Structure formats: structure tokens, C-alpha cells
Design a protein around this ligand. Structure first.
Ligand SMILES: CC(C)CCC[C@@H](C)[C@H]1CC[C@H]2[C@@H]3CC=C4C[C@@H](OC(=O)CCC(=O)O)CC[C@]4(C)[C@H]3CC[C@]12C
Ligand SMILES: CC(C)CCC[C@@H](C)[C@H]1CC[C@H]2[C@@H]3CC=C4C[C@@H](OC(=O)CCC(=O)O)CC[C@]4(C)[C@H]3CC[C@]12C
Ligand SMILES: CC(C)CCC[C@@H](C)[C@H]1CC[C@H]2[C@@H]3CC=C4C[C@@H](OC(=O)CCC(=O)O)CC[C@]4(C)[C@H]3CC[C@]12C
Ligand SMILES: CC(C)CCC[C@@H](C)[C@H]1CC[C@H]2[C@@H]3CC=C4C[C@@H](OC(=O)CCC(=O)O)CC[C@]4(C)[C@H]3CC[C@]12C
Ligand SMILES: CC(C)CCC[C@@H](C)[C@H]1CC[C@H]2[C@@H]3CC=C4C[C@@H](OC(=O)CCC(=O)O)CC[C@]4(C)[C@H]3CC[C@]12C
Ligand SMILES: CC(C)CCC[C@@H](C)[C@H]1CC[C@H]2[C@@H]3CC=C4C[C@@H](OC(=O)CCC(=O)O)CC[C@]4(C)[C@H]3CC[C@]12C
Ligand SMILES: CC(C)CCC[C@@H](C)[C@H]1CC[C@H]2[C@@H]3CC=C4C[C@@H](OC(=O)CCC(=O)O)CC[C@]4(C)[C@H]3CC[C@]12C
Ligand SMILES: CC(C)CCC[C@@H](C)[C@H]1CC[C@H]2[C@@H]3CC=C4C[C@@H](OC(=O)CCC(=O)O)CC[C@]4(C)[C@H]3CC[C@]12C
Ligand SMILES: CC(C)CCC[C@@H](C)[C@H]1CC[C@H]2[C@@H]3CC=C4C[C@@H](OC(=O)CCC(=O)O)CC[C@]4(C)[C@H]3CC[C@]12C
Ligand SMILES: CC(C)CCC[C@@H](C)[C@H]1CC[C@H]2[C@@H]3CC=C4C[C@@H](OC(=O)CCC(=O)O)CC[C@]4(C)[C@H]3CC[C@]12C
Lengths: 598, 145, 71
């Protein structure tokens, strides 16, 4: 069973720790090979039925026992991991397909259970979503569903409102949001005029004058407040970057440039702290799991570019202008990175990932446009300029004018200039125009063909591929944004309170705390008591019974099942009525014989 | 009041929100290109409000078919004879001035080809619902009129 | 409106209400789903009643055989 524990730990991933591999179970195993009886036998039977690919037995063991949602999410993750392992080990592909179908079935079961729990009681459904699962490595149903990449579980309304409650921290608010927390951040005497939540209304915790200080601490640790502080600091830093790139700079940086440099350095230290405080042990694995996000890669590239440019800028000329140029490219990047902040709004975020989805069709359009553009450019340049030396200006003249021809600039003075003739100048003097190049009349004709093909065919076809793939991309992007709400909320909850330009104080605070702890659990669970645990378990059993037997009622009242039952009964009834007619004929013959006898 | 113009007008009012979200994204891209072009082509500048105007001036008209072809990449750092034939010395090349046409190409591509066509897509795929809602709301507001 | 017109309007409203309600009933009663459900319930009751009829027919056949054996 210890090896089964390792298998569960490997398949579950992350920081999961199976109960088999814990010291209590290993001590019991060494001392023995009702103490040997399992308190939740259906948990072990479910894990066994999932592991040995017995789907019907797993679906039966899911119905019986407590913690049904957690079991379904664990089974979904285990089936997905086993399917990935079977595909990686070059096994039979049918095994991988069946395991993925089992994962999808368990995910659908968890989603239907969430629907039933939402329909019954909202608050008990959140408590079901949030309470710590002591039998599942102290995890949370939301963590289990994120870890299984169950997009439909987090996109559900109950999980969305739970994430909204997690977003506001210990604040009631929930009415004209954003403006109240901005006014609280800018004006600290506006914090105490806010409606705060109860002490034990919904205490999501990670590890389990005074009211004024308590209100201040509860406001400043709320993830919406930390997000708005981060956003205001980023906007101020971007304005300072605009000021230091627009105005000229002297030999030494000004105050605003020093603030910008400090922001860059402090953001880089924060990203290094995010690298170090990750899930793996080996540093290369942490680096890889941090570079798996594209925004982290571009952040590292931009920070390195800013370092190079600032090093170049602190020297003398001509390196200062090169550093200024690198500063301009970096300000392009940070203006683009404003879309990270735009990712939080319910409409802008799906818009941004929708743009990211259409970039591939834009790429395929750029490929075809590049073929046509280079054909026209090479033809025009090689016709109008016969005697040319090898120079890189020819490649530039290939791309220069045909590219601006797409955006309404046809360069009408150079389409077909008058040549091979004598035309009087502005002063009336006779001016002899240079002789006509051979085949120069071909250039306007191929220009007409190029402009027609490009502007009329390819742009309208890109419009068509943007239009006919819009609905699917929009639905997928909305669902992926609703899924990534959890990642955004957890990132802003694990982040320090202070924004990046002042984050060095919080970094020194963590350094001093870490050194003090050395010299002497990433999530938000609930840690409910035992009566509440029983109440939640009873609510889960009620929801499971409700869902199963309502599914039975839906199956029994369908037209197809009714028609099938009626046809089978009519067939049996026809055979029985034939038997009845035969017995009636026999009885009539017997009655006729009895009447003849008497 | 007309049976066709009224629903058209409130349909325009419904598409204004998608136009707003387009103006937001266009504003981000436009300010990135404008700040980059102005801070590259003009290194020695005093604090003046003309810089903010030069951020927004030419990139905005770049969306509507005016690319300002005489200022995309002017010839500089060389000697070119004038109209009268006199030798005229052009001002020296600014550092990184070749970046401006490249980011201009990227900006024009992204804006004119991606964002305008995406706004076309969001106008097209939300047209039927907005049209039905607008017709029904116009028929409701007939009583108020 | 006047009082006779008010009565006429009220009677028209009662006619419309009756028409709508019992036409809704006719639509519900002539639907495929209600027809299928009624047929299945009648077929189930008919199967149980025919089983009872077969049992009583067996009893009657045994009684007739006994009466024929007696006479
Ligand atoms: C936290 C960051 C990301 C943005 C927050 C905004 C403010 C806290 C900063 C942004 C710009 C700063 C200003 C930038 C430039 C100056 C000029 C500066 O003038 C001098 O230092 C003149 C004397 C000298 O040359 O030493 C005085 C501070 C001040 C007003 C700064 C005060 C603090 C400001 C308003
Ligand atoms: C929180 C977010 C939404 C906005 C906060 C940012 C502003 C408070 C910052 C961003 C840029 C700053 C400006 C950047 C540069 C200057 C020039 C500076 O003037 C000088 O440095 C020259 C003379 C002097 O030294 O005072 C005076 C401050 C000012 C207007 C700053 C005032 C404060 C500003 C507007
Ligand atoms: C098919 C479409 C979607 C993309 C193809 C277009 C680009 C690959 C082209 C269009 C305009 C070109 C630019 C036009 C002008 C220049 C300036 C050139 O530098 C100089 O000419 C030096 C300064 C001078 O001599 O004036 C460097 C190449 C570059 C950036 C070109 C690089 C390639 C660009 C961006
Ligand atoms: C510099 C100027 C002259 C640009 C040249 C314009 C035309 C001579 C080119 C540009 C795009 C070309 C088209 C691009 C794609 C296709 C599809 C391809 O046809 C197929 O693969 C056959 C299947 C089918 O036709 O559906 C080749 C012909 C055609 C119409 C090409 C015909 C020639 C076109 C119109
Ligand atoms: C399928 C598509 C992508 C074809 C694209 C091909 C052209 C865009 C390339 C291919 C070979 C290139 C040429 C290869 C070599 C040279 C010599 C080069 O000459 C020098 O650098 C001067 C030599 C010196 O003095 O050092 C100028 C660019 C040029 C003409 C290149 C111009 C652009 C060319 C024609
Ligand atoms: C493949 C698609 C998706 C992206 C488009 C990539 C190419 C079309 C670009 C990328 C890099 C570009 C090159 C980058 C630099 C130069 C040098 C440039 O040289 C000069 O301008 C010399 C200066 C002068 O004499 O004016 C000429 C264009 C060229 C070859 C560019 C031509 C177009 C290139 C190959
Ligand atoms: C992202 C898109 C959808 C909107 C962003 C574009 C506008 C915010 C920009 C584009 C052109 C700009 C205008 C261009 C020129 C001027 C003239 C300027 O006044 C002067 O220059 C004074 C007179 C003179 O000196 O000639 C005042 C700002 C204003 C109206 C600018 C205000 C901001 C405008 C409207
Ligand atoms: C001044 C010039 C250089 C303008 C800059 C043009 C590009 C460098 C920018 C403009 C718009 C940007 C895009 C805007 C939106 C997105 C979606 C966003 O991606 C996601 O949110 C991931 C989800 C997904 O890709 O669907 C960030 C990348 C991307 C493609 C951006 C990549 C960089 C782009 C193409
Ligand atoms: C996230 C986006 C919205 C960032 C946008 C930032 C820029 C568009 C702003 C922010 C700070 C602004 C600067 C703040 C202060 C000044 C000083 C100001 O100088 C004067 O008015 C002269 C002083 C005098 O003589 O009275 C000229 C505008 C300028 C450069 C501003 C230009 C426009 C800037 C760079
Ligand atoms: C947010 C979206 C939905 C709407 C777009 C709003 C901004 C892009 C606009 C609104 C007001 C505009 C400002 C109004 C007035 C001016 C003063 C103007 O100053 C001059 O032109 C100085 C005169 C000169 O020296 O030429 C420079 C542009 C600027 C900052 C404008 C820049 C663009 C702004 C911030």
C-alpha cells in the first residue's frame, strides 16, 4: 500500500501527500506486516477502482460514502494523469482514450453535484467548496478542481461567486466597487467609513483604537485593495517612464528616472522571490515552472533589457543614446503589459485573450500578404532600377512602398511619372525628363493587380475568418477567463501588501522574519468544526440522493423509455392474450361438451 | 419616430459600448507607438505640452489612411542636391531612427488589420440580438412618444 | 364607456378567458408526451388486469374440468 501511496502522490502532482505515505500509516504497516480498519472504506475502494481502471465499480463506490465532490475531483485528476502517463509511455491509445472518457465522466459528475448543491443551499455549497479535506492531503475542492484543470467547475456560478467573496477579503461592500477602494487607498480616513464583514462570516485563511487598527489591517490585506494599489503604482510608474523618455536626460538620472529604476529593480527582486517560493525542490524545475507562463518570460526579458539600457546610459556618449533607445522599446513593452491589468475586468479580459486567439489567423494572413508583397516589390524594384550595385537598400526598397500601399498610401506621384519627353518647368524653362525605362508600363499594371488582390481579397478574407470563428473563440475565452479568475485571486492574495516601488520594506520584513524563524500550505481553506463538518456531510448526502434519484425520474419519464416499456408490455400482452384465446377456445369446447352431456 | 430609423439609432447606441472597448485597446496601442516615435525622433526636448500632443497627433490619423509618407523615413546623414542643384547637407541621423518605421509597420498592422476587423466581428456577431431588442424597445417607447 | 358596453366588454373577456384556458387544455391533451404517458399508464394497468384475468381463467378452466369430470 506504500507503493500505491507513491503512485497516488506521483499522479496527483504538486504538493499532494497520500495518507499511505504518512508516518502513521508506515508505522502501522511496519507494526502489523479496529486499528487495521479504514474509517472511510469507500475512499480507498474508490481509489482502487480508479487505479485498476474499473469504471462501473468506481461509479458505484462514488454514490456510497461521504465527500463525494472531493472523490469525483480526485478521480478526474487521477484518470487524466493516468491517461497522460499511458500516452507518454507509448502504450495502447485506446487505454488513453478510455481514461480520458472516465476523467470527463467524473468531471461531469462533479459539475452536476455542484449544480445540485447550488440549487439546494448556496452557503452550504460554498462551505462544501471551501472546507479542508483531511483525507485528501488537507486540500480544498476548489484546489482539486483547479489542479484537475476543470474549466467547467470554476466557470460555474457558485464557484464564481465564491471567488468574488474571496476577492473582497473581509469587506462587505459589493456595491459600486473599485471607487470605494480607490478612495480608501488615496484617503486613509475613508477606510473607517466602510462596512466591514463579520469576524466569522466566511474566514478563508491559509494557516490557522483596536477596532480601528483591525479595520485598517483587514482593508489593507484584501486582494481587491492590493490589486488596486498595484494598479495605481503601475500607472504612476508608467507616467514617470513617459516623463523620463519624453524630456531630455542629463549625464546623471533625474529623480523620476531613479524612481523608475527602483521600480524595475524591486519588480525584478519580487519576480526572483516568486521563483524561489514555488512548488518544486530542484531549482531548474522552479525556473521551468515559472517560465511556463509567457508573461513571466517577457517580464524577465524586459528587466534584462532595462538593466542593459541603464548600464549603457550611465556611461558617456554614444552609449547614452543607445540606452535611451532601449528605454523606448521597454516603454512599448510596458504599455503592452497594461493588458495584464486590463485582464481583470469582466469584458476587457476575454477581449484580450480573444485578440490573442485571432493572432494566429493574423499570422497566416501575414504569410500570404508577405508572399504577394515580396512578388510585387521585387518586380517593381527590378524593373524601375536596372543598373544597381549590391547593396542592402534593395531589400529595403522591396518592402518599403508595397507595405504602405495596404494602408491607403498608393504614392500617386510615383505610380507612373511622365518620362521620355520634354515638359516645361514652373519657370517655363524647357526641361528634359530622363528616358523611359524598358517595361516601365508593367509597373502600374502589376501594381493594380497587387492592390486589388491584397486590399480587396486578402483583407476581406481575414474579415471572414475573424467573423466565422468569433463565437467559439468568444465562448472559450469567457470560460478561460472565468477559470483564470482563481489564479489571479491567489496571485494577488499571496502577494505582499506594499506595491512594487515600496516593496523593498516588505522584502526586508520577510528576510528578517525568515532569519528570526531560522535562528529559533498555499491556499484558502475554511477549517470548520466537527458539528459543521457533520452538517456539510449530511448536506452532501442529501444532494447526492437528490441528484441520483432525480436522474432516475428524468430517465423514467422520457419519451424513449416510455415507448420502449410500452412496446415490451404490448408484446408480452399479445403473447399472453394469444394464450388466453387458446384457453378460451378450450373452455368453450369443454362447456359445449358439458351442455351436450346434460 | 420612423419605423426604421429609430431602431437604427438605438442600435448605434448599443454598439457604442463595443466601440468604447475598441477605443480603450486602440488607445493603449496608439500611445505606445506615439511615445516611442516621439521619444526616439526628438531626444533633446524641454518640458512642454506639445509632447503630449505629438504623442496623439500622427498615430491617430495613421488609422484613417494618412500614413504621412514624407516622414516615415526621411533621408538624413547625407548630402543631397537641392532643386537648384546646390549641395545641401541633411541633418545627422538620430540614433535608433530606423526603429521608427519598423514599430510603425507593427503598429499599422496591429491597429488597421487586427483591431478594426475584430470590431467588425463584434459588431456582426451581436447584431441580431441588438436588432431584435432595439425593435422591441422602439415599439415599447412608441407609447411614451 | 357606458354600462351596456361595459357588460359587453366583460362578457367578451370571459369568453376569451374560457377560450384560452380550455384551448390550452386541448393543446396539453393532444400533445405527443401526454398521449404517450397516458398510453403507458393504461398499458401497465391493462397488463396487471390481464394477468388477473389469466389467473381467473385458469381457475374457471379448472372448475369446468372438475364439473365435466363430475358429470
Ligand atoms: C510610487 C510611484 C510609482 C508613483 C507615485 C507618484 C508620486 C509619489 C511621485 C511621482 C512623481 C514624483 C515627483 C517627480 C519630481 C519631483 C521634482 C522634485 O524636485 C527636486 O527634487 C528639485 C530639487 C533637486 O533638484 O534636488 C521634487 C519631488 C517631485 C515633485 C516628485 C514628488 C513625488 C512624485 C509626485
Ligand atoms: C496614482 C496614479 C493614478 C497617478 C499618480 C501619478 C502622478 C501623481 C505623477 C505621475 C507623473 C508625475 C509628474 C512627472 C514629472 C513632473 C515634473 C516635475 O518638474 C520638474 O522636475 C522640473 C522642476 C522641479 O524640479 O520641480 C514636477 C512634478 C511632475 C509634474 C510630476 C507630478 C506627479 C505625476 C503627475
Ligand atoms: C507582410 C507584412 C505584414 C510585413 C512585412 C513588412 C515589413 C517586413 C517591412 C515594412 C517596412 C519595412 C521597414 C522600412 C524601413 C526600414 C528602415 C531601414 O533603416 C534604414 O533605412 C536606415 C536609416 C536610413 O537610411 O534612412 C531598416 C529596415 C526598415 C526598418 C524596414 C524593415 C522591414 C519593414 C518593417
Ligand atoms: C504582383 C502582383 C501581380 C500580384 C499577383 C496577383 C495574382 C497573379 C495572384 C495573387 C494571389 C494568387 C492566387 C492565390 C491562390 C490561389 C489558389 C490556388 O488554387 C488552388 O490551389 C486550386 C484550388 C482552388 O482553386 O480552389 C492557386 C491559384 C490562386 C487562385 C492564385 C492565382 C494567382 C493570384 C490571384
Ligand atoms: C523566398 C524569399 C524569402 C526570398 C527572399 C530573397 C531576398 C529577399 C534576398 C535573398 C538573397 C539576398 C541578397 C544576398 C546578398 C546581397 C549582397 C549585399 O551586399 C552587401 O552587403 C555589400 C557587400 C560589401 O560591400 O560588404 C546586399 C544585399 C543582397 C543584395 C541581398 C538582398 C536580398 C536578397 C536578394
Ligand atoms: C515571416 C513573417 C511572419 C515576419 C516578417 C519577417 C521578415 C519579412 C522581416 C524580418 C526581419 C526583416 C529584415 C531586417 C533588416 C533588414 C535590413 C534592411 O537594410 C537596410 O535598410 C539597409 C540600409 C539602407 O541602405 O537603407 C533591409 C530590410 C531587412 C533585410 C529586413 C527585411 C524584412 C525582414 C526579413
Ligand atoms: C484612441 C483614439 C480612439 C482616441 C485618441 C485620439 C485623441 C485623444 C487625439 C487625436 C488627435 C488629438 C488632438 C490633436 C491636436 C490638438 C490641438 C491642440 O491645440 C493646439 O495645438 C493649439 C493650436 C496650435 O498650437 O496650433 C489641443 C489638443 C488637440 C485638440 C488634440 C487632442 C487629443 C486628440 C483629439
Ligand atoms: C508600437 C507597436 C510596436 C505596437 C505593438 C504591437 C504588438 C507588439 C502588440 C500589440 C497588441 C499585442 C497583443 C494584444 C493581446 C494579446 C493577448 C494576450 O494573451 C493572453 O492574454 C493569453 C491568452 C491568449 O493568447 O489567448 C497578450 C498577448 C497578445 C497576443 C499581445 C501580443 C503583442 C501585441 C501583438
Ligand atoms: C498610462 C498612460 C495614461 C500614461 C500617460 C502619461 C503621459 C501621457 C503623461 C503623464 C505625465 C505627463 C507629463 C507631466 C508633466 C509635464 C510637464 C509640463 O510642463 C509644463 O507645463 C511647463 C512648465 C511651466 O513652464 O509652467 C508639460 C507636459 C508634461 C511633460 C506631461 C506630458 C504628458 C505626460 C508624460
Ligand atoms: C479614455 C478614452 C475613452 C477617451 C480618450 C481620452 C484621452 C485620450 C484624452 C482626453 C483629454 C485629452 C487631452 C486634452 C488636452 C491636451 C492638451 C494638449 O496640449 C497642447 O496641445 C499644447 C499646445 C501645443 O503646444 O501645441 C495636448 C493633448 C492633451 C494632453 C490631450 C491628450 C489626450 C486626452 C488625455
Amino acid at each position: 500500500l506504500i507503493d500505491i501511496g507513491l503512485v497516488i502522490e506521483y499522479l496527483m502532482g504538486g504538493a499532494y501527500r497520500c495518507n499511505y505515505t504518512r508516518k502513521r500509516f508506515r508505522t502501522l504497516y511496519h507494526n502489523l506486516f479496529e486499528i487495521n480498519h479504514f474509517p472511510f472504506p469507500f475512499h480507498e475502494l474508490m481509489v482502487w477502482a480508479v487505479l485498476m481502471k474499473r469504471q462501473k465499480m468506481a461509479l458505484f463506490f462514488w454514490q456510497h460514502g461521504e465527500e463525494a465532490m472531493a472523490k469525483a475531483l480526485v478521480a478526474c485528476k487521477l484518470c487524466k494523469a493516468m491517461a497522460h502517463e499511458a500516452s507518454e509511455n507509448d502504450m495502447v491509445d485506446d487505454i488513453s482514450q478510455e481514461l480520458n472518457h472516465n476523467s470527463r465522466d467524473f468531471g461531469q459528475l462533479a459539475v452536476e453535484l455542484l449544480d445540485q448543491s447550488y440549487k439546494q443551499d448556496e452557503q452550504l455549497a460554498m462551505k462544501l467548496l471551501t472546507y479542508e479535506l483531511k483525507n485528501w492531503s488537507n486540500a480544498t475542492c476548489l484546489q482539486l478542481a483547479v489542479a484537475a484543470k476543470h474549466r467547467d467547475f470554476i466557470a460555474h456560478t457558485c464557484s464564481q461567486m465564491l471567488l468574488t467573496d474571496m476577492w473582497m477579503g473581509r469587506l462587505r461592500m459589493r456595491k459600486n466597487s473599485g471607487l470605494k477602494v480607490i478612495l480608501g487607498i488615496l484617503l486613509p480616513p475613508s477606510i473607517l467609513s466602510l462596512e466591514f464583514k463579520n469576524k466569522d462570516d466566511m474566514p478563508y485563511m491559509t494557516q490557522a483604537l483596536i477596532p480601528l487598527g483591525r479595520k485598517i489591517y483587514e482593508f489593507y490585506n484584501a486582494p481587491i485593495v492590493k490589486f488596486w494599489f498595484y494598479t495605481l503604482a503601475y500607472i504612476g510608474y508608467l507616467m514617470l517612464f513617459n516623463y523620463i523618455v519624453l524630456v531630455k536626460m542629463e549625464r546623471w538620472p533625474s529623480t523620476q528616472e531613479w524612481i523608475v529604476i527602483s521600480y524595475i529593480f524591486t519588480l525584478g527582486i519580487e519576480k526572483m522571490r516568486e521563483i524561489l517560493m514555488s512548488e518544486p525542490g530542484k531549482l531548474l524545475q522552479k525556473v521551468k515552472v515559472w517560465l511556463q507562463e509567457y508573461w513571466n518570460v517577457t517580464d524577465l526579458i524586459a528587466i534584462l533589457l532595462f538593466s542593459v539600457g541603464m548600464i549603457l546610459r550611465l556611461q558617456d556618449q554614444p552609449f547614452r543614446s543607445d540606452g535611451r533607445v532601449i528605454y523606448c522599446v521597454n516603454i512599448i513593452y510596458w504599455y503592452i503589459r497594461l493588458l495584464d491589468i486590463f485582464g481583470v475586468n469582466k469584458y476587457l479580459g476575454p477581449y484580450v485573450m480573444m485578440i490573442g486567439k485571432m493572432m494566429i489567423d493574423m499570422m497566416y494572413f501575414v504569410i500570404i500578404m508577405l508572399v504577394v508583397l515580396m512578388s510585387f516589390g521585387v518586380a517593381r524594384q527590378a524593373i524601375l532600377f536596372p543598373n544597381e550595385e549590391p547593396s542592402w537598400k534593395l531589400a529595403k526598397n522591396i518592402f518599403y512602398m508595397p507595405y504602405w500601399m495596404i494602408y491607403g498610401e498608393v504614392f500617386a506621384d510615383q505610380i507612373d511619372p511622365p518620362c521620355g519627353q520634354n515638359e516645361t518647368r514652373e519657370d517655363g524653362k524647357i526641361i528634359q525628363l530622363p528616358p523611359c525605362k524598358t517595361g516601365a508600363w508593367i509597373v502600374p499594371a502589376i501594381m493594380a493587380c497587387y492592390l486589388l488582390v491584397a486590399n480587396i481579397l486578402l483583407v476581406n478574407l481575414l474579415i471572414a475568418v475573424f467573423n466565422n470563428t468569433f463565437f467559439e473563440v468568444k465562448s472559450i475565452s469567457n470560460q478561460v477567463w472565468k477559470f483564470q479568475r482563481y489564479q489571479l485571486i491567489m496571485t494577488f492574495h499571496e502577494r505582499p501588501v506594499l506595491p512594487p516601488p515600496l516593496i523593498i520594506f516588505s522584502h526586508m520584513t520577510m528576510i528578517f522574519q525568515h532569519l528570526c524563524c531560522r535562528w529559533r500550505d498555499y491556499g484558502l481553506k475554511l477549517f470548520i468544526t466537527d458539528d459543521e463538518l457533520k452538517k456539510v456531510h449530511d448536506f452532501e448526502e442529501q444532494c447526492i440522493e437528490e441528484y441520483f434519484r432525480e436522474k432516475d425520474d428524468r430517465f423514467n419519464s422520457s419519451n424513449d423509455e416510455r415507448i420502449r416499456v410500452t412496446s415490451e408490455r404490448v408484446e408480452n400482452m399479445s403473447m399472453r392474450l394469444e394464450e388466453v384465446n387458446e384457453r378460451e377456445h378450450s373452455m368453450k369446447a369443454s362447456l359445449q361438451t358439458v351442455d351436450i352431456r346434460l
